Write a protein that holds these residues in place. Structure first.
Motif, PDB file in Angstrom:
ATOM      1  N   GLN A 143     -16.466  -7.046  -8.977  1.00  0.00           N
ATOM      2  CA  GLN A 143     -17.240  -7.041  -7.982  1.00  0.00           C
ATOM      3  C   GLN A 143     -17.179  -7.485  -6.917  1.00  0.00           C
ATOM      4  O   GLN A 143     -17.549  -6.731  -5.621  1.00  0.00           O
ATOM      5  N   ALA A 144     -17.478  -8.284  -7.075  1.00  0.00           N
ATOM      6  CA  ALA A 144     -17.400  -9.014  -6.046  1.00  0.00           C
ATOM      7  C   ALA A 144     -16.741  -9.201  -4.595  1.00  0.00           C
ATOM      8  O   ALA A 144     -16.977  -9.018  -3.615  1.00  0.00           O
ATOM      9  N   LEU A 145     -15.767  -9.300  -4.493  1.00  0.00           N
ATOM     10  CA  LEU A 145     -14.073  -9.205  -3.990  1.00  0.00           C
ATOM     11  C   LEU A 145     -14.660  -7.698  -3.728  1.00  0.00           C
ATOM     12  O   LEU A 145     -13.934  -7.661  -2.271  1.00  0.00           O
ATOM     13  N   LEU A 146     -14.975  -6.489  -4.261  1.00  0.00           N
ATOM     14  CA  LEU A 146     -14.837  -5.409  -3.958  1.00  0.00           C
ATOM     15  C   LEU A 146     -15.763  -5.458  -2.744  1.00  0.00           C
ATOM     16  O   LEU A 146     -15.759  -4.660  -1.251  1.00  0.00           O
ATOM     17  N   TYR A 183      -6.581  -5.728   9.697  1.00  0.00           N
ATOM     18  CA  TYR A 183      -7.225  -5.840   9.469  1.00  0.00           C
ATOM     19  C   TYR A 183      -7.372  -4.501   8.231  1.00  0.00           C
ATOM     20  O   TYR A 183      -7.563  -4.885   7.111  1.00  0.00           O
ATOM     21  N   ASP A 184      -6.747  -3.094   8.956  1.00  0.00           N
ATOM     22  CA  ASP A 184      -7.010  -2.070   7.377  1.00  0.00           C
ATOM     23  C   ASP A 184      -6.025  -2.557   6.658  1.00  0.00           C
ATOM     24  O   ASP A 184      -5.856  -2.138   5.248  1.00  0.00           O
ATOM     25  N   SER A 185      -4.622  -2.859   7.420  1.00  0.00           N
ATOM     26  CA  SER A 185      -3.523  -3.693   5.913  1.00  0.00           C
ATOM     27  C   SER A 185      -4.159  -4.286   4.921  1.00  0.00           C
ATOM     28  O   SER A 185      -4.180  -4.557   3.832  1.00  0.00           O
ATOM     29  N   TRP A 186      -5.173  -5.243   5.431  1.00  0.00           N
ATOM     30  CA  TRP A 186      -6.049  -6.259   4.699  1.00  0.00           C
ATOM     31  C   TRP A 186      -6.916  -5.876   3.654  1.00  0.00           C
ATOM     32  O   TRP A 186      -7.153  -5.937   2.015  1.00  0.00           O
ATOM     33  N   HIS A 187      -7.197  -5.236   3.918  1.00  0.00           N
ATOM     34  CA  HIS A 187      -8.087  -3.616   3.420  1.00  0.00           C
ATOM     35  C   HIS A 187      -8.070  -3.245   2.383  1.00  0.00           C
ATOM     36  O   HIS A 187      -8.131  -3.178   1.170  1.00  0.00           O
ATOM     37  N   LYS A 188      -6.794  -2.722   2.794  1.00  0.00           N
ATOM     38  CA  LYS A 188      -5.847  -1.652   1.808  1.00  0.00           C
ATOM     39  C   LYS A 188      -5.053  -2.679   0.655  1.00  0.00           C
ATOM     40  O   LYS A 188      -5.010  -2.489  -0.317  1.00  0.00           O
ATOM     41  N   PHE A 194      -7.049  -5.572  -5.687  1.00  0.00           N
ATOM     42  CA  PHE A 194      -8.298  -5.071  -7.166  1.00  0.00           C
ATOM     43  C   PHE A 194      -8.328  -3.783  -8.226  1.00  0.00           C
ATOM     44  O   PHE A 194      -8.919  -3.962  -9.265  1.00  0.00           O
ATOM     45  N   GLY A 195      -7.154  -2.990  -7.319  1.00  0.00           N
ATOM     46  CA  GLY A 195      -7.070  -1.678  -8.466  1.00  0.00           C
ATOM     47  C   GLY A 195      -5.934  -2.259  -9.338  1.00  0.00           C
ATOM     48  O   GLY A 195      -6.096  -1.962 -10.836  1.00  0.00           O
ATOM     49  N   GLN A 196      -5.276  -3.263  -9.045  1.00  0.00           N
ATOM     50  CA  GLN A 196      -4.211  -3.955 -10.174  1.00  0.00           C
ATOM     51  C   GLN A 196      -5.604  -4.689 -11.331  1.00  0.00           C
ATOM     52  O   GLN A 196      -5.080  -4.317 -12.423  1.00  0.00           O
TER      53      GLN A 196
END
Lengths: 223, 296, 145
Positions: A143-146, A183-188, A194-196
């Motif tokens: 949750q904190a990572l998200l 930055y978009d790549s890092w976010h994705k 986080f999805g995994q």
């Protein structure tokens, strides 16, 4: 001329003009080495200022020695060109000193903006496996990572890029564009990782709930 | 909130990870190239950067010399500061100088044969100027003492490039790296024969130069005016100091045209051992007595 | 197919180093200052797809670097354990002994050490080159590294 160079930093009058700063990043192994290099930009600015000064300095000395004859040529600095007037400056060395100081200040501002850009160098530097190991599969960790990914995305509002760093106009445009892409790549990538992690957590929770429900259905609690 | 704290803590952890390793090596600064008025060494420093430019800059020059060594291949730019010709430019040189430049302090000099005696005098002038800048620096004397201790250890660390201290050793206790080179090297034969000056006087001048070096702390350098002897080696010793490169070149003593005595390449006795050849050159003879200048 | 790629790579150490060099060359094939591959009078290049694929291929290369890093760490750790055993043996060795059994054991150990010295030297030179390459990739040894 010292006043004119000071104005350039900020018929006898004149008006000089200079190009813009080479603002950029790099991809050296995905490493953002600014284009042009900061040292290259400082040297180029020094060269431009030297050209502006050599505009005055290129004045030949008073060629009255043509009346004289016999000795070998004596085209000294102040002899051939206008040299001794550098020492004979009526305003004192303050003009050239202030020019050097203003160059140093512009370079310092460039260094500050460059440090601001290079603060994202860890975005390329991200060791994702070590990050996953450090964060752990804690649900609060996820949750904190998200939340942190959302905040990092929120700290990357990029509309204008080319931050003109004064007379050396910093071409922050393409560097900022590549940075926004990174930055978009890092976010994705964070979204995928986080999805995994969250899929693993949800699968574990579903398996535990299914095991509890199967135990309750097979062995009734009120047996 | 705490999510941003965690993300930035991860950021800081990776920052520590990168800082512990990806720091590569030192860069940025260069030596105090004490360029003198009328040196003509503009092209000399250019060839030191591998270039050839006699463009008389705005007095001094914050010249650029990157260096990428394939073990890291990262271009290490050099804050090359060729000193100007104006004594008025002293403050600008100080303005060029910096407190961090004081932390990264290295020095450089050369020696042309034409006024080589005055090159000793001009060297003294520049050294006094450097001391004046150091006084103008007015740095933390404890930090200054620690840095001086480190420099003295490095001087004591001068092993063979292949405790007991001299009284004149490091007399100019600057505590910074120092370099002395030999300009106008092609003119020595013209000096020795065409100018008919004594090569014994040339050797005694080199000995007095080594003595001034012992006062200062600048190693002797192989150099050629035309052939550019050991310029790569000059940059090599420069990197060995600043970039900390693994210096390996053995020193050269016998060849006058390539006289590179590194740090520790000769002691005060070895200087006196070199002084044995000064037979006609008495040790009490003046540099002015060993000087040559026509009023033409 | 990364698992099959790792299986095909195997425990080849010089092979892993050469593969790292090839990966560096291939990543160099990707990437450029421009985006349109303007070779020829009509030359284009899908820059955005190139950037996205560059991200994907950088991820693949970084994963390969991590796997090779795990392997190289295993090799270095095995070398370190062997070096510790050898240092203990050298400390406990007694060459100048008239005892037959102890002398025979010491001589066998010396012959085995002389034999393994060449392999250890090859591994050490490969490890030095690999450490340089990992730094080239910034493959920094972790706190456990």
């Amino acid at each position: 001329g010292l006043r004119a160079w000071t104005q350039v930093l900020l018929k006898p009058g004149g008006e000089p003009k200079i190009k813009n700063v080479v603002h950029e990043l790099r991809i050296t192994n995905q490493v953002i080495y600014l284009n042009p290099p900061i040292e290259e930009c400082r040297y180029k600015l020094y060269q431009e200022m030297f050209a502006w000064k050599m505009v005055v300095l290129s004045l030949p000395r008073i060629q009255s020695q043509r009346y004289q004859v016999g000795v070998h040529y004596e085209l000294t600095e102040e002899e051939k060109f206008y040299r001794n007037a550098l020492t004979r400056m009526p305003d004192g060395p303050v003009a050239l000193e202030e020019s050097y100081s203003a160059v140093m200040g512009i370079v310092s501002e460039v260094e500050q903006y460059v440090k601001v850009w290079l603060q994202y160098q860890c975005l390329w530097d991200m060791q994702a496996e070590n990050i996953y190991n450090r964060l752990g599969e804690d649900l609060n960790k996820w949750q904190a990572l998200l939340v942190q990914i959302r905040k990092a995305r929120g700290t990357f509002d990029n509309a204008e890029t080319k931050k003109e760093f004064g007379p050396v106009v910093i071409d922050y445009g393409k560097v900022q564009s590549k940075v926004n892409l990174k930055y978009d790549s890092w976010h994705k990538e964070v979204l995928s990782k986080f999805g995994q992690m969250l899929g693993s957590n949800m699968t574990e929770f579903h398996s535990q709930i299914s095991k509890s429900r199967q135990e309750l259905e097979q062995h009734s609690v009120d047996t | 909130s705490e999510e941003e704290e965690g993300q930035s803590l991860w950021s800081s952890i990776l920052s520590e990870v990168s800082t512990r390793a990806r720091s590569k090596l030192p860069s940025g600064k260069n030596i105090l190239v004490f360029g003198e008025d009328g040196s003509g060494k503009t092209t000399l420093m250019t060839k030191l950067q591998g270039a050839e430019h006699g463009k008389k800059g705005r007095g001094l020059e914050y010249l650029y010399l990157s260096v990428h060594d394939e073990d890291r291949d990262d271009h290490t730019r050099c804050n090359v500061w060729i000193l100007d010709g104006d004594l008025y430019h002293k403050g600008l040189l100080k303005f060029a100088v910096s407190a961090e430049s004081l932390p990264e302090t290295l020095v450089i000099f050369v020696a042309d044969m034409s006024r080589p005696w005055t090159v000793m005098e001009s060297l003294q002038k520049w050294a006094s100027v450097l001391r004046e800048h150091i006084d103008k620096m007015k740095i933390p004397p404890e930090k200054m003492r620690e840095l001086e201790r480190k420099f003295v250890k490095d001087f004591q660390d001068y092993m063979e490039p292949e405790l007991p201290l001299g009284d004149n050793v490091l007399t100019h206790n600057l505590g910074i790296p120092v370099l002395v080179v030999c300009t106008k090297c092609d003119a020595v034969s013209v000096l020795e024969k065409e100018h008919d000056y004594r090569d014994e006087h040339l050797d005694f001048i080199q000995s007095h130069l080594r003595r001034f070096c012992l006062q200062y702390g600048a190693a002797l350098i192989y150099t050629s005016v035309k052939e550019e002897k050991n310029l790569d080696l000059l940059y090599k010793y420069i990197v060995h100091k600043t970039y900390g490169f693994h210096f390996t070149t053995p020193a050269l003593v016998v060849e006058k045209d390539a006289v590179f005595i590194p740090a520790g390449w000769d002691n005060e006795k070895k200087i006196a051992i070199l002084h044995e050849n000064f037979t006609t050159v008495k040790p009490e003879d003046a540099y002015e007595d060993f000087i040559v200048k026509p009023p033409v | 197919q990364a698992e099959n790629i790792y299986n095909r790579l195997g425990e080849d150490l010089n092979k892993w180093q050469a593969l790292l060099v090839q990966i560096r060359k291939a990543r160099g094939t990707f990437d450029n200052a421009e985006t349109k591959k303007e070779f020829g009078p009509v030359v284009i290049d899908y820059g955005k797809v190139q950037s996205k694929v560059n991200l994907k291929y950088d991820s693949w290369h970084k994963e390969v670097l991590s796997k090779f890093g795990q392997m190289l760490g295993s090799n270095m750790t095995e070398f370190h354990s062997q070096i510790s055993k050898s240092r203990q043996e050298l400390e406990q060795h007694s060459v100048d002994t008239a005892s037959t059994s102890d002398a025979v054991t010491f001589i066998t150990y010396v012959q085995s050490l002389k034999r393994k010295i060449k392999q250890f030297e090859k591994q050490v030179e490969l490890y030095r080159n690999g450490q340089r390459l990992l730094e080239k990739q910034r493959f920094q040894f972790p706190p456990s590294w």
